[PDB]
């Protein structure tokens, strides 16, 4: 069973240096979030590790993006600060930052994506059965299927006048996939050049 109520409960529990500081802080919150997603903590520990190492940056991007709906031309960080796109551009990361604004924040704003929908999309990303090394991909696939069954039922009840809303939510996941890949590429470069402080948890996520 996979009740949206529990997924919501889990949710409601230089500029680049600021952003990396906020990401490290939020990685601790992400672990606490995943443990509250039904059945995640019952997976083998090694598989919990695999799923979070595979999805962490997409999970973080989805969350701050949704928190940024009320920010004009910028994002809200976990530390409470805003980053405006002018500042992102002046730090050399303007293109990937604008993709977050255009493909994620502005779309979440325009459809008024709610926190239950965000949480369910977050849980679908978490339960990624393509993650390499999983001891039982089918088990993770089954949990993903339970989430998107629950999400579809929620959308049809809450937004009956929008039959396409469920598909619209899922069709933000390719953009999230692409944005995450490019964000990660930038972060690996920051680590290589060494001029950006990276705290311990964020650093560990950049290990092999």
């Amino acid at each position: 069973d996979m009740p949206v109520e529990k997924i919501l409960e889990a949710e409601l529990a230089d500029p680049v240096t600021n952003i990396c500081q906020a990401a490290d802080k939020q990685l601790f919150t992400l672990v606490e979030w995943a443990k509250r997603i039904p059945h995640f903590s019952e997976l083998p520990l090694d598989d919990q590790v695999i799923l979070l190492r595979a999805g962490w940056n997409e999970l973080l991007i989805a969350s701050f993006s949704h928190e940024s709906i009320a920010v004009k031309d910028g994002i809200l960080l976990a530390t409470g600060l805003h980053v405006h796109r002018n500042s992102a551009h002046s730090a050399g990361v303007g293109a990937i930052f604008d993709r977050v604004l255009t493909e994620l924040v502005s779309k979440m704003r325009d459809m008024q994506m709610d926190k239950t929908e965000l949480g369910c999309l977050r849980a679908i990303v978490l339960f990624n059965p393509d993650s390499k090394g999983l001891s039982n991909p089918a088990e993770v696939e089954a949990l993903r299927e339970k989430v998107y069954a629950s999400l579809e039922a929620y959308c049809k009840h809450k937004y009956p006048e929008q039959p396409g809303r469920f598909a619209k939510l899922l069709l933000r996941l390719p953009a999230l996939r692409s944005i995450g890949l490019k964000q990660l590429e930038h972060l690996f470069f920051f680590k290589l050049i060494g001029d950006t402080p990276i705290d311990t948890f964020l650093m560990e996520m950049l290990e092999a």
């Binding site: 601790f28 672990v31 443990k35 520990l45 919990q48 590790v49 979070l52 190492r53 311990t200 948890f201 560990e204 290990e207």
Partner: peptide
């Protein structure tokens, strides 16, 4: 090998 993440997941 993912020290912090293991440390945080295992503890209840």
């Amino acid at each position: 090998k993912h020290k912090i993440l293991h440390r945080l997941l295992q503890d209840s």
